[PDB]
Amino acid sequence: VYRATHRLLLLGAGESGKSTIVKQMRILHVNGEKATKVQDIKNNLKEAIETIVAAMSNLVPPVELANPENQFRVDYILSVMNVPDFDFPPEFYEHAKALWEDEGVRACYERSNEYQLIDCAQYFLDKIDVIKQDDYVPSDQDLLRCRVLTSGIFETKFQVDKVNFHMFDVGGQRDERRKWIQCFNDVTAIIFVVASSSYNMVIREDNQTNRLQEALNLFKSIWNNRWLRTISVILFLNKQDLLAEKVLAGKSKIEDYFPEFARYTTPEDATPEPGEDPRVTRAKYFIRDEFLRISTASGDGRHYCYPHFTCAVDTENIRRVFNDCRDIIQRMHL
Amino acid sequence: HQSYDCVCVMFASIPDFKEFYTESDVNKEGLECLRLLNEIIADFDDLLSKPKFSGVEKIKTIGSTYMAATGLSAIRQYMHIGTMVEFAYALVGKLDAINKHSFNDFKLRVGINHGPVIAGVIGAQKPQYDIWGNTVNVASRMDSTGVLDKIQVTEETSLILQTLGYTCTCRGIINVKGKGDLKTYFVNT
Amino acid sequence: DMMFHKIYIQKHDNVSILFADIEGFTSLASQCTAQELVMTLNELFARFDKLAAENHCLRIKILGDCYYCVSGLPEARADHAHCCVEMGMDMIEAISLVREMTGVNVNMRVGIHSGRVHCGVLGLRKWQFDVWSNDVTLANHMEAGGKAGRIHITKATLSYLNGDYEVEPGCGGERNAYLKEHSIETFLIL
Numbered sequence: 001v002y003r004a005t006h007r008l009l010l011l012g013a014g015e016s017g018k019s020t021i022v023k024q025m026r027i028l029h030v031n032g033e034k035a036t037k038v039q040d041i042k043n044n045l046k047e048a049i050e051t052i053v054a055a056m057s058n059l060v061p062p063v064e065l066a067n068p069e070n071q072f073r074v075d076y077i078l079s080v081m082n083v084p085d086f087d088f089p090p091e092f093y094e095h096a097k098a099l100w101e102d103e104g105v106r107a108c109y110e111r112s113n114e115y116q117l118i119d120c121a122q123y124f125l126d127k128i129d130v131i132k133q134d135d136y137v138p139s140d141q142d143l144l145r146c147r148v149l150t151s152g153i154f155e156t157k158f159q160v161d162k163v164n165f166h167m168f169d170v171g172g173q174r175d176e177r178r179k180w181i182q183c184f185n186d187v188t189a190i191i192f193v194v195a196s197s198s199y200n201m202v203i204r205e206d207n208q209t210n211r212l213q214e215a216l217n218l219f220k221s222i223w224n225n226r227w228l229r230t231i232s233v234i235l236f237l238n239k240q241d242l243l244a245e246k247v248l249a250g251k252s253k254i255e256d257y258f259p260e261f262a263r264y265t266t267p268e269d270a271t272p273e274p275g276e277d278p279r280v281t282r283a284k285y286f287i288r289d290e291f292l293r294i295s296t297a298s299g300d301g302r303h304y305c306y307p308h309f310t311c312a313v314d315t316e317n318i319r320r321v322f323n324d325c326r327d328i329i330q331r332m333h334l
Numbered sequence: 335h336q337s338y339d340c341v342c343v344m345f346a347s348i349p350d351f352k353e354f355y356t357e358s359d360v361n362k363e364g365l366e367c368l369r370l371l372n373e374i375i376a377d378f379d380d381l382l383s384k385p386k387f388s389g390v391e392k393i394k395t396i397g398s399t400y401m402a403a404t405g406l407s408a409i410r411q412y413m414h415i416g417t418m419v420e421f422a423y424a425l426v427g428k429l430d431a432i433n434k435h436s437f438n439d440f441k442l443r444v445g446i447n448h449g450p451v452i453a454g455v456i457g458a459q460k461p462q463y464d465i466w467g468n469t470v471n472v473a474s475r476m477d478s479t480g481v482l483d484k485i486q487v488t489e490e491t492s493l494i495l496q497t498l499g500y501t502c503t504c505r506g507i508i509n510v511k512g513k514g515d516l517k518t519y520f521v522n523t
Numbered sequence: 524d525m526m527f528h529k530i531y532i533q534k535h536d537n538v539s540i541l542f543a544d545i546e547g548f549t550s551l552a553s554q555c556t557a558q559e560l561v562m563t564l565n566e567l568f569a570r571f572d573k574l575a576a577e578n579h580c581l582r583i584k585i586l587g588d589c590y591y592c593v594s595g596l597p598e599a600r601a602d603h604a605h606c607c608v609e610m611g612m613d614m615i616e617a618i619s620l621v622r623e624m625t626g627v628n629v630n631m632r633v634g635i636h637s638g639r640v641h642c643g644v645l646g647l648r649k650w651q652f653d654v655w656s657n658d659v660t661l662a663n664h665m666e667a668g669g670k671a672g673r674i675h676i677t678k679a680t681l682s683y684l685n686g687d688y689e690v691e692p693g694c695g696g697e698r699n700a701y702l703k704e705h706s707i708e709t710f711l712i713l
């Protein structure tokens with residue numbers, strides 16, 4: 001009875017991509033409904049725009065607008081920033097769109113690593129016009145791109161080929177980690193989730209500690225955990241799209257954060273995605289190898305590590321990789 | 335059941351625990367919590383085997399609070415009290431390592447007294463071993479009115495730890511229901 | 524079983540949890556000798572331990588002057604609420620003779636809630652079968668917010684009483700914060 005099920009645990013830092021993965025499970029393997037998530041997106045929009053403008057002055061150097069008329073909009077936005085039950089009137093959208101057009105405002109969005117900003121910014125702001133319509137129905141991709149932070153443990157049942165899958169979601173942030181233990185015993189396997197893209201950014205929890213390092217350290221915590229000696233960890237090197245983009249952009253260089261990159265040459269076993277740039281391949285694998293160094297150094301073959309290059313916001317790449325995982329689960333566990 | 339002259343009682347609770355204990359369907363209605371408690375206790379019990387703590391004799395646990403006493407194995411002079419402290423520092427060593435792996439931040443709050451007790455068995459049914467007397471009450475009240483990450487001792491108990499290389503700051507005064515106001519010390523590190 | 528130590532704990536619904544404290548334990552401890560106290564205590568709890576087994580209550584522990592058992596263990600009993608109540612009934616009369624005998628005013632403060640518990644043992648060394656849950660936390664607090672020589676019971680411990688005893692407004696929220704903050708309707712038995 002109890003063995004034909006599988007209890008999977010989703011771990012990783014805050015914003016890594018864990019909630020998006022469970023979402024993809026619903027999109028992939030589960031059965032008015034969404035009208036409530038519209039509000040949620042509206043806030044993503046609000047929180048995103050007001051964050052970009054607030055940042056502008058507190059940057060070094062601070063950023064000026066290319067249209068100083070927009071000041072009054074900037075003024076509008078900041079005046080509504082902390083309003084509790086926001087009415088979302090037609091202005092807000094006109095004003096938000098306006099600012100989002102301002103080349104200066106965008107310039108500040110380029111430096112979005114220098115301050116804490118959600119991942120759905122450029123995406124939703126590019127579609128203000130759609131969201132504002134009173135008859136707005138959010139796409140599947142919209143519900144995926146939305147962001148509500150995880151607070152607590154959340155069981156989610158799905159079934160693939162009559163085989164059963166329990167999935168637990170947890171707070172990736174530090175205050176939240178103290179709940180993880182409540183999933184440790186009986187765990188069929190760990191899915192550790194990593195924002196590959198976040199290599200140029202610091203955690204929310206202290207505005208100083210690098211997100212990917214916090215990721216590396218967190219993994220090392222889990223890999224060498226005392227109650228996880230047996231349990232293997234499938235590694236989702238998430239947000240591969242955002243990584244690729246940053247690498248090609250060539251703005252913030254990797255070796256300027258993780259200087260060992262400077263040495264790294266590309267592996268021999270490398271299987272690059274058809275016509276992916278040698279540079280993106282170089283980058284994505286360095287981050288993989290970073291994680292593997294920790295997994296290599298201990299375990300005794302009592303448990304193993306399975307890397308995967310992934311993009312949670314892409315149901316295409318997720319079906320592929322989650323399937324790569326059932327293979328692994330059904331070999332091992334049996 | 336026989337009396338004693340100089341027994342050194344210690345209480346070490348983990349007040350941060352009661353908060354952390356939750357009862358959801360996810361955590362088998364709190365079973366996943368009591369699981370972590372067990373680990374902790376067991377980790378503390380693994381200490382008593384250590385050759386240096388062979389005079390330490392665990393009494394019970396009350397909730398998430400560890401009760402232990404030295405000098406029940408009796409008939410230089412108070413080297414046993416110093417062990418008790420030596421032991422309380424060890425619980426913090428173990429509690430600190432649980433934190434590392436449990437992504438938590440449990441502080442231990444200790445109280446160490448000493449003096450006369452009466453040890454023995456109580457209850458007709460399952461006869462279990464315990465210790466009584468005012469020494470124990472105070473020991474307990476040193477814990478409850480304690481401070482996290484600190485050991486609280488009484489005056490004489492302080493004086494002795496002083497004779498053994500321990501430095502002590504005065505905490506102040508405490509109404510111990512029964513004995514009234516008495517002065518207490520934190521053990522410095 | 525391999526990575527966590529084996530836990531000797533097991534879920535148990537529909538049980539009732541009594542707690543009983545001695546009122547004026549310090550005044551007694553003041554009067555009589557350091558030793559005679561322990562003998563006046565050991566006598567009473569071995570007297571209690573008889574009553575428990577007759578009333579089908581499995582005694583848990585003595586914690587100084589705090590005594591606590593639970594009905595519904597080891598094997599479930601539908602009298603489980605009546606039993607803890609019945610257990611309390613005796614304790615208030617079992618103290619009565621060993622109160623007059625000492626010439627000092629002591630009584631029992633009783634508190635019974637009902638619900639699920641976990642029960643088992645913690646650690647490796649010096650096992651002592653115990654009970655843990657919010658229902659136990661509540662039980663404990665009922666005794667804490669009890670009335671001298673009276674039995675304090677909860678919403679649920681009436682729902683399992685099947686209306687056989689005559690209760691009265693308890694007012695626990697005004698004698699204990701836990702009860703107030705958690706809006707527990709409490710009662711006293713007549």
Ligand SMILES: Nc1nc2c(ncn2[C@@H]2O[C@H](COP(=O)(O)OP(=O)(O)OP(O)(O)=S)[C@@H](O)[C@H]2O)c(=O)[nH]1
Pocket residue numbers: 012013014015016017018019020021118119120144145146147148149150170171172173193238239240241242310311312313314
């Ligand atoms: N571009 C891109 N964005 C992603 C990807 N995966 C997740 N995101 C974005 O990251 C944001 C946060 O993701 P989320 O899944 O909520 O983090 P989390 O790990 O759950 O963090 P928490 O919920 O434990 S606090 C979302 O807005 C989502 O759109 C990805 O693969 N590519």
Ligand SMILES: C=C[C@@]1(C)CC(=O)[C@]2(O)[C@@]3(C)[C@@H](O)CCC(C)(C)[C@@H]3[C@H](O)[C@H](OC(C)=O)[C@@]2(C)O1
Pocket residue numbers: 351352355371396397398399653654655656657659660663
């Ligand atoms: C261990 C977890 C938890 C929450 C569960 C529980 O019911 C308790 O164990 C009781 C109530 C319970 O076990 C009955 C005895 C006693 C001694 C009264 C306990 C303490 O109050 C515990 O907390 C303390 C203070 O140790 C407490 C509350 O802790």
Ligand SMILES: [Cl-]
Pocket residue numbers: 012013014015016193194195196198211212215
């Ligand atoms: Cl991350």
Ligand SMILES: [Mg+2]
Pocket residue numbers: 544545546547548549588
């Ligand atoms: Mg009392």
